[PDB]
Design a protein around this nucleic acid. Structure first.
Length: 896
DNA sequence: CGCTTATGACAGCCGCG
DNA sequence: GCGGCTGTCATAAGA
């Protein structure tokens, strides 16, 4: 098979690499890699190497990486550019694997683990690791087995072996409901003492050294804990065996790095490739959201679970590891990482760095062309203008249609041809609004321009534009294979309804391309076995395409980040500013065009149809459009929705393309790529007193959407942005009551809203105290505390945390409030035994007794309702010109 | 090296018969 | 006592 690398490391003058050889077996090697860097030479010197600016360069081969680094140091002192890939690991990978690498995941050892550490005195700090490790569950992808290390005797108790029979039984039967699909994949290993467990674990680790190591929070807890525990008991020399190269290091805080291993903490792979931003990121919360089943439940505090119910303790450890494997089975984020890393030829963990990923992609691309990359330069962090957001007029908007530009920044780079080596010059910049209204002199009739004053060559392809354009082509390329493979999805599926009993074999065709009609019906006459393999193959294909297509998308959207980053090799302040300023002009330019077109077709004069714009989207009020045809002439909702849809497709879009076409010629851009697509269509139900939507201000609105990019909803979906209903700090009961308030406003009207509001006020005091409590995170708690009391400028939540501390000062059983975590908050009436206006206890749990009964007795309902429900509702209703309460004065809306 | 553009909940001034 | 400001802190998109 085709060889590929697993991990790579640089230690001194050697490159340590683990990899899969042609035979498919994992191997390791040390190589005295000789790097090459470059320097500018004279034109008279014959060479084949040129920097991206066309300047000639001489290749300097060094005897070892240390000499290369030394040379770079000398060049900086002399003041002359040192060109080439200074990260020798990338160079080595590029040189060793100069070809599209095909990898076989079944050969990559992926370890998923989790440990448990009983601790009476609070969270067991990894940097100390003062407590024994009493449980370890380590899943290995190659053996597809769950290895469980159980400590029977510890200073905290002696227990009996864990029972797999009891683990499989149901809850009602005293069991742990450990899934039957892993029950046979568990290898149990009990131990008499801790030293025997760690040493057996460490030995196990040497025999099955992980390539990719993941799990939940493993980088911040499990890995550092295991490392330090071993180091503290045995020597550091023993702890270093956790690294296949016996080499480790420490980073920010207590982040241990194990050379020869790629750590991909699943908690990070989630906060990166899932894009959903959950309120909480605990394995329990995430597991519920993705699998509709969280971690195993248990009674009492975790610090006492091992001694009170060791059976459940071990099963809990095994489930925690399985949940992560289940989520991955759904998100496939590990597979993605591998795919992206192998694509850019970087260490798998670098996938977390857009800068490193793009650096490697451009580097390998330029290498094939014999070009030499620029030297990374030092750049002062300098803030520059970003996206444009229009200030909306607070109000209700009955009918709205939004339009979004596709891949704005990446497109702008291509259109204007922005790149460091394509910079051609500058021009006198006029006020941005002069360009938006096309009253300013045309910037240049020779170069491609950006409203910030930069001019670019049109006669040459830029390094960046070209590189981004290639990923765009690979995108539609792969998204084209799984597109046709989808067509074959029915040619094979439906071929099972009325096939034949002819015993045959599965044909050899490429599902990437449409099935040839010369073999089309040839398949509609095979056995039940082959046909079930014909669709099986079509699955691998239609799925493989997804990963590639998704990876290309992630790269495309992360390019701008890198370009704005001073640590990026191709960074340039002018270029980053050219991108955002252009985007700012484009959005406002098109806003002007849409208004101009809609006024003309409506006979109106200087009317504002665009009510809001943000970055690459605009929202248009369609009331005039609807009235132009009369609202009473529509049969139902779907009727006017079909009308606006049609009007957008055959009237607005063409007018938009014409508008952007003009802007491209005005800035004399290299190529027109400003494409807008109708996004949403929103409005109230036909025949209702509802208000399709409203805006309170920037980033704050709600719309009753009926259609999104062509897909018509059976029922209108609320699209809410920025309002408290979207805030994790908003109490549960209130978050849903605020949503129902908005739904009623958009779909049913004022009266319905007032009816609900009244009922909710009446029944507020009957809601669970946990559902009506706001949530917040405890930060800098030690910055505003003065001996149990609040210091100067002490936040409200933090003030409540202290009130809790004091009230529980002297109890170790009651839940303590740690830092950086989330906590519930509740206001208290004046004259409470807590001597404060509020109290806050840890989240996810109920108020410990001894104070619970009192809290419920002193909690201020009035203030709670007013502060979390009424205040924000009034914000929505004021903007929407609605009253949530009868007999409300009209003058209250005026300033004095 | 794994940021902008924003809003809102509070705290703490200054000023005014 | 509140305005009308100036900070700190806490939170969402999208790239």
């Amino acid at each position: 098979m085709k060889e590929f690398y697993l991990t790579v490391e640089q230690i001194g003058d050697s490159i340590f690499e683990r990899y899969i050889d042609s035979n498919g077996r994992e191997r390791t090697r040390e190589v005295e890699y000789k790097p090459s860097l470059f320097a500018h030479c004279p034109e008279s010197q014959a060479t084949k190497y040129f920097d991206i600016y066309g300047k000639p360069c001489t290749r300097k081969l060094f005897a070892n990486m240390r000499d290369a680094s030394q040379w770079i140091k000398r060049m900086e002192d002399i003041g002359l550019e040192a060109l080439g890939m200074d990260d020798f690991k990338l160079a080595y990978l590029s040189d060793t694997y100069n070809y599209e690498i095909k990898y076989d995941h079944t050969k990559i050892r992926v370890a998923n683990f989790d440990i448990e550490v009983t601790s009476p005195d609070g969270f067991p700090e990894p940097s100390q690791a003062k407590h024994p490790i009493d449980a370890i569950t380590h899943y290995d992808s190659i053996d597809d087995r769950f290895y469980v290390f159980d400590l029977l005797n510890s200073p905290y108790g002696n227990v009996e072996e864990w029972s797999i029979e009891i683990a499989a039984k149901l809850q009602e039967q005293g069991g742990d409901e450990v899934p039957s699909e892993i029950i046979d994949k568990i290898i149990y290993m009990p131990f008499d003492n801790e030293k025997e467990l760690l040493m057996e674990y460490l030995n196990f680790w040497q025999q099955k050294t992980p390539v990719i190591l993941t799990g939940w929070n493993v980088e911040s807890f499990a890995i550092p804990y295991v490392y330090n525990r071993i180091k503290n008991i045995f020597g550091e020399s023993t702890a270093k065996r956790l690294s296949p190269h016996r080499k480790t290091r420490v980073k920010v805080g207590e982040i241990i790095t194990l050379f020869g291993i790629s750590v991909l903490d699943y908690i990070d792979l989630y906060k990166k490739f899932s894009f959903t931003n959950q309120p909480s990121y605990s394995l329990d919360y995430i597991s519920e959201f993705e699998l509709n089943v969280g971690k195993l439940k248990y009674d009492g505090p975790i610090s006492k679970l091992r001694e009170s119910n060791h059976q459940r303790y071990i099963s809990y450890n095994i489930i925690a590891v399985y949940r992560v494997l289940q989520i991955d089975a759904k998100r496939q984020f590990i597979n993605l990482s591998l795919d992206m890393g192998y694509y850019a030829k970087i260490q798998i963990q670098s996938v977390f760095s857009p800068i490193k990923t793009w650096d490697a992609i451009i580097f390998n691309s330029l290498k094939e062309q014999n070009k030499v990359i620029p030297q990374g330069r030092s750049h002062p962090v300098q803030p520059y203008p970003g996206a444009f957001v229009k200030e909306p007029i607070p109000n209700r908007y009955k009918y709205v249609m939004s339009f979004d530009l596709t891949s704005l920044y990446p497109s702008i780079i291509r259109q204007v041809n922005i790149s460091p080596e394509t910079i051609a010059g500058t021009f006198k910049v006029a006020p941005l609004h002069d360009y938006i209204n096309a009253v300013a002199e045309r910037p240049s009739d020779v170069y491609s321009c950006s409203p910030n004053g930069m001019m670019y060559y049109k006669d040459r392809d830029g390094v960046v534009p070209t590189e981004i354009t290639k990923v765009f082509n690979q995108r539609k390329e792969h998204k084209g294979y799984m597109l046709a493979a989808q067509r074959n999805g029915e040619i094979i599926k439906e071929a099972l309804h009325n096939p034949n009993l002819s015993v045959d074999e599965p044909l050899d065709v490429d599902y990437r391309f449409d099935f040839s009609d010369e073999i089309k019906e040839k398949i509609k006459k095979l056995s039940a076995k082959s046909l079930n393999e014909m669709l099986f193959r079509a699955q691998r294909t239609e799925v493989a395409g997804m990963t590639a297509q998704i990876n290309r998308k992630l790269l495309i959207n992360s390019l701008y980040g890198a370009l704005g980053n001073v640590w990026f090799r191709y960074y340039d302040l002018r270029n980053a500013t050219a991108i955002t300023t252009f985007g700012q002009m484009a959005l406002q330019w098109i806003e002007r065009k849409v208004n101009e077109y809609l006024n003309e077709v409506c006979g109106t004069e200087g009317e504002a149809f665009v009510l809001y714009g943000d970055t690459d989207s605009i929202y248009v009020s369609a009331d005039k459009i609807i009235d132009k045809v009369g609202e009473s002439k529509f049969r139902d909702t779907n009727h006017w929705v079909d009308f606006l849809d049609k009007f957008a497709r055959e009237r607005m879009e063409p007018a938009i393309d014409r508008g952007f076409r003009e802007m491209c010629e005005y800035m004399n851009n290299k190529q027109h790529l400003m494409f807008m697509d109708r996004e949403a269509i929103a409005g109230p139900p036909l025949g209702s007193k509802g208000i399709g939507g409203f805006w309170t201000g920037k980033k704050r609105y709600a719309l009753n959407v009926w259609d999104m990019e062509g897909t018509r909803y059976a029922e209108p979906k609320l699209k809410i942005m920025g309002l408290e209903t979207q805030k994790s700090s908003t109490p549960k009961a209130v978050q849903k009551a605020l949503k129902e308030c908005i739904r009623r406003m958009l779909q049913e009207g004022e009266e319905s809203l007032q009816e609900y509001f009244k009922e909710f006020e009446k029944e507020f005091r009957q809601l669970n105290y946990i559902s009506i409590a706001s949530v917040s995170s405890a930060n800098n708690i030690a910055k505003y505390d003065v001996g149990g009391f609040p210091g100067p400028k002490c936040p409200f939540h933090i003030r409540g945390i202290l009130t809790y501390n004091r009230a529980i000062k002297g109890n170790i059983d009651a839940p303590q409030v740690v830092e950086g975590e989330k906590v519930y908050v509740l206001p208290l009436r004046e004259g409470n035994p807590f001597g404060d206006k509020c109290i806050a206890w840890p989240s996810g749990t109920e108020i410990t007794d001894l104070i619970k009964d009192d809290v419920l007795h002193w909690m201020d309902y009035t203030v709670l309702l007013e502060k979390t429900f009424i205040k924000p509702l009034e914000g929505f209703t004021s903007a929407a010109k609605l009253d949530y309460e009868k007999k409300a004065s009209l003058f209250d809306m005026f300033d004095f």
